[PDB]
């Protein structure tokens, strides 16, 4: 009944084919592509919050060497579990289902300096994950959804010149 589908999945797959990269900065940088999902099967009458976090994908970091990503060493200690609350939260099921849910404003940083940003470790791979939480639920039920097409490596600068070009092209 509940269905959460990735929007613009073909576009994410073009980046994933190259190995996607997302820039992190001291002040925080918005993602491109933007993560957007369509939702059906919630109770239109109920209220829900939408949350976003980033799950580390490997037990090692990465390095771009001779035009290829390769295992690049031991990981750094895990980033703190930062969660991003979608600014429309809390809202009716009808609100979330009437048009795609877009996380256009989240910013990724390599420095914990508030502002509701997500701290990531450079040269580590992450996968976005969305959680739906129902308001007023004594069971505190939450549903979690992963998006394999949206995996990316966090970078202080683009390594792959094809990614640099792709980002300029489709944006
Ligand atoms: C009265 N009634 C019982 C079923 C009657 N047919 C409901 O409230 C209801 C009705 C229709 C659809 C859903 N949708 C469910 C689907 C999962 N979910 C949910 C998702 C994320 C977090 C917490 C969650 F509880 C919902 O709220 C609920």
Question: What is the per-residue DSSP string for 80-115?
Answer: P---EE-TT-SEEHHHHHSS-EE-TT-EEESS---S
Q: To test the ligand 1 pocket, which listed residue (3, 42, 47, 90) has its Cβ within 8 A of the most ligand atoms?
A: 42
**Residue 82 in contact with residue 121, Cβ under 8 Å?**
no
Q: What separation in angstroms does the CA of 33 have from each of 19, 23, 102?
A: 13, 12, 11
Resolution of the experimental structure, in angstroms: 1.9
159, β-bridge pairs: none
Q: How far is the CA of 55 from the centre of ligand 1 (A)?
A: 26
Q: Ligand 1 pocket, 2 CB below 6 A?
A: yes
**Residue 150 in contact with residue 7, Cβ under 8 Å?**
no
Q: How far is the CA of 43 from the centre of ligand 1 (A)?
A: 5
Nearest ligand 1 atom to the CA of 134 is 23
The whole-angstrom distance between residue 150's C-alpha and the CA centroid of its chain comes to 7
Contacts of 165 (CB under 8 A, 6+ apart): none
**Residue 147 in contact with residue 131, Cβ under 8 Å?**
no
Q: E strands within the chain?
A: 3-6, 21-23, 29-30, 36-40, 47-56, 61-65, 68-73, 84-85, 91-92, 101-102, 107-109, 118-119, 125-134, 142-146, 152-155
Q: What's the half-sphere exposure (Cβ side, CA atoms, 13 Å) at 24?
A: 21
- Which residue matches tokens 């959804």? 145
């Amino acid at each position: 009944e509940l269905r959460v589908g990735l929007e613009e999945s073909e576009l994410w797959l073009r980046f994933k084919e190259l190995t996607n990269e997302m820039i992190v900065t001291k002040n925080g940088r918005r993602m491109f592509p933007v993560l957007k999902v369509n939702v059906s099967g919630l109770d239109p009458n109920a209220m829900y919050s939408f949350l976003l976090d980033f799950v580390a994908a490997d037990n090692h970091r990465w390095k771009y060497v001779n035009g290829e990503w390769v295992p690049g060493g031991k990981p750094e200690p895990q980033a703190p579990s930062c969660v991003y609350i979608h600014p429309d939260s809390p809202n009716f099921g009808a609100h979330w289902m009437k048009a795609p849910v877009s996380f256009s404003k989240v910013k990724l940083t390599n420095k914990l300096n508030g502002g509701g940003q997500i701290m990531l470790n450079s040269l580590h791979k992450y996968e976005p994950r969305i959680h739906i939480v129902r308001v007023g639920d004594p069971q505190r039920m939450i549903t979690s959804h992963c998006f394999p097409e949206t995996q990316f490596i966090a970078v202080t600068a683009y390594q792959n010149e094809e990614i640099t070009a792709l980002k300029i092209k489709y944006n």
